[PDB]
């Protein structure tokens, strides 16, 4: 199962946030529209990581991560009313939110 975020009740969230639609997505620093990550601190969009095997993104969204610490970010096209998959790059697990639907909130998005 997968554990609850020491940030999930904890999580700051910057002010004069900018509204996130429900499509139309793109990665901010590369041509990617699939594999995108809304960080819940500031609302970025960037993709995922790469691995091992050639799988996966351009790595703009753990890029982000490193440079500002915002811990948390959920996968754009997983938001469903029950939930979502939501990465911590800080507990380095997929985790639950049990405030995501607050965080989505925050950007306009109705879970
Ligand atoms: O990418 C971002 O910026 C945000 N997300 C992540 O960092 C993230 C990290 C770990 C996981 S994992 O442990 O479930 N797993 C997902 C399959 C991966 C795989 C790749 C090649 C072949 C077989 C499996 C291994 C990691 C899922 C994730 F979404
Ligand atoms: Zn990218």
Sequence with gaps: ???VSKHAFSLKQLDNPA????CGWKCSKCDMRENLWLNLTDG?????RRYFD???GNNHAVEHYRETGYP???KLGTITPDGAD???????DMVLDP??????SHFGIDM
Excluded: M, N
């Design 72 to 74: 948390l970010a959920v």
């Design 1 to 3: 199962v997968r554990q």
């Design 86 to 92: 939501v990465y911590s790059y800080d507990e380095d």
């Design 99 to 104: 405030s995501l639907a607050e965080h989505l």
């Design 19 to 22: 509204r996130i639609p429900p």
């Design 44 to 48: 970025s969009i960037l993709c995922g």
């Design 54 to 56: 050639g799988s996966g």
